[PDB]
Amino acid sequence: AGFDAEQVRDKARKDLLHLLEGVRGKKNLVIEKDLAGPLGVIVKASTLRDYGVDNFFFLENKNTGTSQRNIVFIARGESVRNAHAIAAQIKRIQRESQTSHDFHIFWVPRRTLFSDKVLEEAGVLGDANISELPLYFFPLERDVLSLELNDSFRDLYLAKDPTPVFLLSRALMGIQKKHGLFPRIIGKGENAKRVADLLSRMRQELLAGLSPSTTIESVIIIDREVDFVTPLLTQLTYEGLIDEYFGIQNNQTDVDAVIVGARKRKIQLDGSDSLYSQLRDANFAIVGSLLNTVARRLKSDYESRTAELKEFVKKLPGYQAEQQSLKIHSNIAEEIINYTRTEIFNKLLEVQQNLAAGADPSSQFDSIEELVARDTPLPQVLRLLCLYSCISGGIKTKELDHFRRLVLQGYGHQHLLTLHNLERLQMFLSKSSPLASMITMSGSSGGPDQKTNYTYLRKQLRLIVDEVNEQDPNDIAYVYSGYAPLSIRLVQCVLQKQYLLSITKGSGGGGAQGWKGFEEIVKHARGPTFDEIQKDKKTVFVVFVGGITFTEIAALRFIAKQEEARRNIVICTTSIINGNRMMNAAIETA
C-alpha cells in the first residue's frame, strides 16, 4: 500500500531501458564517469549488453569508439562541464569519419537551457536526438535513497548553485505523486525551508486531484549547515571508519589486493552480505567481538555432525561466499585497528573528543600544534580547526593567525585558497567576525545567519552521553562513543520526544506531533524551524539537504529499530558526505 525502495529501482531501469529501446540497433554508450557508479545500482552491465550495448565509454576519457553507428551519451544536464564535453566529442567523432553518425543524448533528469545553448553554439545541436532520463533518487539500500550528487556540497555551499535543492524537491514531489501528499512537512534550516517552499508552490501549480497520503506519516528535512560538527568528527562505526580510511562510493571501496586475498581491488559494500549487514552500523570497538562470534557460529555449523556428498558440493558456493566475507572483513578490521593505534590517531581523537565534550578550545592548542609538527595529513588538521571554530563560535583571532601560519608553512602556501574557502563555508572563522557568533537569547542580535549554539545545545539536547555501552547501545551517541549527532537529536525532537524528554527533563501525551516541546531549544540551532500541514504502519521520510554521513545513517537505523512497530524510516539525501569530502571541496575549488 505504501512506499518501497524497489519500485524506484524498477522505474529507473524501465526508464533507462525504454530509451535504449528507442535507439534502434546495437549502440555505443558514453557515460559521465560520476554517473556510472549510481547507474550500476539500478541496472547491471550484462542487462545493457542484452539491449545492444557493444561498448561502454567514460565521457572524460575522450576515446569514444567507431564500432557502432549509434552513439549514446548519458550525463547530467545541470553540469556546465558535460555540455561542452559532449559537443567536443561529437565534433571530434564526426571528423574521424565515416565511423559513427547517429548521436543520442539522455540528459539526467532534465534538459537545461544552458545545455541546449552550448550544443547549438557548437553547431552539433541538430545532430543529436535528445531525450530526458528522469533519474533522481538511487536506492543504495531499502532504507536509503540518494541523489548521488557528489559535488552538491561544494555546488550548494561554496558556489551557491541552487540546483541541488531544486532537484531534491522534484524528487520529493515525485513520491507525493505516487503515494499522496506528505501530511506534514517538518524541518530545520534555510535550505530545508526552501525545499518545503518549493514543495508547497509545486502543489499550488498542480491545482490547475492530490490528497494527503494514507501510508506516509511525514517528511523531516534537515539542512546540513545546521550541523557541520558531525561530519568534521571521525566516524567510529565500522562503515564510518571504512569511509574515513578507504572511502566509500556507490556502495563500493578499493582496498589493497592482499586484503581480498586473491594496484588495489574493488569490494562490494551493501546489505546483501549477511555479515556486513551486522557489522556496518556497529561501533568499531565491538567489531572484533562480532567477527569472533560469526567465526565461531561458522565453525559450529561446519562441525555440526553418499548423495549427501553431492549436497555438499551444491553448498560449496555458499561456503566460499560466507568464508570470503568473513576473511575480507577480518582483514579490513585488522587494517583499521592498525590505523587507530598510532599516536597521531589517538591524539586526533583526543582533541576531537575534548572539543566535543566542551573543554576550553585554547587547552587543545598545544596538541594541535604538535599534530602539525608530526605532519599529520592536511585534511585531519583542517577538520580540527573547523571543529574548533564550528563548536565554539569562532577561533580567537590570535590563535587563528598562528594556526593559519602553521598550515601554510607545514603543507603549502596554495592552501591560503583552502582556508579562504573554509572561511566562505563558515567553518573557519575568527571570533571577531560577526558571522561566527552563535545564537543566544541574551544575544542582542545583528545576525541574519547566527550559528548553531553547541554550548547551549550540548546540555539541552544531551549531546554527550557518558554512560553508553557499545556492546548493546541504548543511545545514538554510540556512533561516536559518547557523542550524539545534533542533526539526529533534532530528528528525535520530532520522532522520539518521550525518550528525549526522558533523558533531559524527566516525565517523558508526548506522542503527538511537530516540534512540540522543543521549539525554544531548537531556536538555538541555525536557521528557520518549520512545520507545515498540507490539507498497516506508516513511512517517515527523513531527508538531508547537503549530505548525510554513515554515522547518521547508523543512528537513524538504530531509531528505526526502536520505532519498528509504528513506523518505517526511509532516509533521503542529496549525497553521502564525510569530513574529508568537505575539506576537498575547499581545497580543490579554484
- Which 3-state string (H, E, C) describes 459-527? HHCCCECCCCCCCCCCCHHHHHCCECCHHHHHHHHHHCHHHHHHCCCCCCCCCCCCCCCCHHHHCCCCC
Cis peptide before 235 (omega within 30 of 0): no
Are 551 and 236 within 8 A, CB to CB? yes
Nine cell digits for residue 483: 557523542
CA 298 to chain CA centroid, nearest Å: 34
DSSP state, residue 235: P
**CA quadruple 391, 395, 400, 406: dihedral, nearest 10:** -30
Amino acid at site 372: V
Which position has the grid cell 553431492?
310
Are both 62 and 155 inside the same structural domain? no
In DSSP terms, which residues pair with 102 in a beta bridge?
A: 70
How wide is the angle at C-alpha 416 spanned by C-alphas 414 and 419, nearest 5°?
A: 125
Amino acid at site 545: V
d(CA 165, CA 152): 9
Are 540 and 570 within 8 A, CB to CB? yes
Exposure letters 16-45 (e unless 16+ CB within 10 A, then b): beebbeebeeebbbbbbebbbbbbebbbee
Sheet holding 144-146, edge to edge: 138-141, 144-146, 567-573, 538-545, 216-223, 184-188, 529-533
Are both 180 and 40 inside the same structural domain? no
Residues with Cβ within 8 Å of 572's Cβ and at least 6 positions away in sequence, in order, are 137, 145, 146, 168, 171, 172, 541, 542, 543, 544
DSSP state, residue 430: B
d(CA 248, CA 242): 7
CATH of the domain at 276: 3.90.830.10
d(CA 373, CA 410): 8
Nearest Cα residue to 529 out of 224, 225, 153, 221: 221
Amino acid at site 493: C
CATH of the domain at 189: 3.40.50.1910
Which position has the grid cell 557499545?
470
d(CA 518, CA 291): 41
Determine phi and psi for 103, rounding to 5 degrees.
Answer: -95, 140
Residues with Cβ within 8 Å of 339's Cβ and at least 6 positions away in sequence, in order, are 245, 345
Cis peptide before 109 (omega within 30 of 0): yes
Are both 57 and 201 inside the same structural domain? no
d(CA 185, CA 219): 5
Are both 331 and 380 inside the same structural domain? no
The bridge status of strand 70-76 relative to strand 27-31 is parallel
Choosing from 320, 342, 364, the residue where a domain stops is 342
Sheet holding 128-132, edge to edge: 53-58, 27-31, 70-76, 102-108, 128-132
Would you give the end-to-end CA distance of the chain in angstroms? Answer: 49
CATH of the domain at 15: 3.40.50.2060
- Looking at the 3D structure of the chain, how many domains does it have? 4
Which position has the grid cell 545534533?
486
Exposure letters 506-534 (e unless 16+ CB within 10 A, then b): eeeeeeeebbebbeebbebbbbebbbbeb
**Experimental method of this PDB entry:** X-ray
What interhelical angle do 80-94 and 113-122 show, nearest 10? Answer: 30
Are 237 and 550 within 8 A, CB to CB? yes
- The answer to whether the Cα torsion of 456, 461, 466, 471 is positive or negative is negative
In DSSP terms, which residues pair with 103 in a beta bridge?
A: 71, 128
d(CA 38, CA 139): 9
d(CA 150, CA 80): 15
d(CA 387, CA 408): 19
Q: How many Cβ atoms from other residues are within 10 Å of residue 413's Cβ?
A: 9
d(CA 488, CA 490): 5
d(CA 367, CA 388): 12
d(CA 257, CA 524): 48
Determine phi and psi for 138, rounding to 5 degrees.
Answer: -105, 125
Choosing from 323, 342, 361, the residue where a domain stops is 342
- By CB atoms closer than 10 A (0-12, 13-18, 19+), residue 414 is exposed
The bridge status of strand 144-146 relative to strand 567-573 is parallel
Are both 74 and 212 inside the same structural domain? no
Exposure letters 364-384 (e unless 16+ CB within 10 A, then b): bbeebeebbeeebebbbbbbb
CA 370 to chain CA centroid, nearest Å: 32
DSSP state, residue 98: S
CA 20 to chain CA centroid, nearest Å: 30
The bridge status of strand 144-146 relative to strand 138-141 is antiparallel
Are both 274 and 240 inside the same structural domain? yes
**Which residues span the domain enclosing 391?**
343-440
Are both 215 and 190 inside the same structural domain? yes
Are 89 and 58 within 8 A, CB to CB? no
3-class state of residue 451 by DSSP: strand
d(CA 529, CA 519): 8
The bridge status of strand 252-256 relative to strand 567-573 is unpaired
Choosing from 408, 440, 472, the residue where a domain stops is 440
Are both 356 and 427 inside the same structural domain? yes
d(CA 383, CA 230): 11
Are 477 and 465 within 8 A, CB to CB? yes
CATH of the domain at 354: 1.25.40.850
Are 539 and 3 within 8 A, CB to CB? yes
DSSP state, residue 224: G
- Biggest alpha carbon–alpha carbon distance for the chain: 85
Are both 503 and 587 inside the same structural domain? yes
Are both 10 and 127 inside the same structural domain? yes
Alpha helix (H) ranges present in 340-460? 343-357, 365-373, 378-391, 397-411, 415-424, 454-460
DSSP letters, 199-238, are HHHHHHHH-----B-SSEEEEEEEEGGG-SHHHHSPP-BH
In DSSP terms, which residues pair with 31 in a beta bridge?
A: 58, 74
How wide is the angle at C-alpha 297 spanned by C-alphas 294 and 302, nearest 5°?
A: 125
Number of helices (H) and strands (E), helices first, in the chain? 25, 14
Nearest Cα residue to 219 out of 493, 555, 572, 496: 572
| Beta strand spans in 235-292 (E) | 252-256, 264-268
Nine cell digits for residue 277: 549487514
Alpha helix (H) ranges present in 221-273? 229-232, 238-245, 257-260
How wide is the angle at C-alpha 248 spanned by C-alphas 244 and 254, nearest 5°?
A: 100
DSSP state, residue 568: E
CA 187 to chain CA centroid, nearest Å: 18
d(CA 492, CA 495): 5
Are 341 and 214 within 8 A, CB to CB? no
Nearest Cα residue to 220 out of 257, 183, 248: 183
Are both 430 and 485 inside the same structural domain? no
d(CA 495, CA 472): 22
DSSP letters, 136-185, are --EEEETTEEE---TTHHIIIIIS---HHHHHHHHHHHHHHHHH-B-SEE
3-class state of residue 285 by DSSP: helix
d(CA 505, CA 447): 30
Are both 228 and 288 inside the same structural domain? no
d(CA 307, CA 322): 23
Resolution limit in angstroms? 2.6
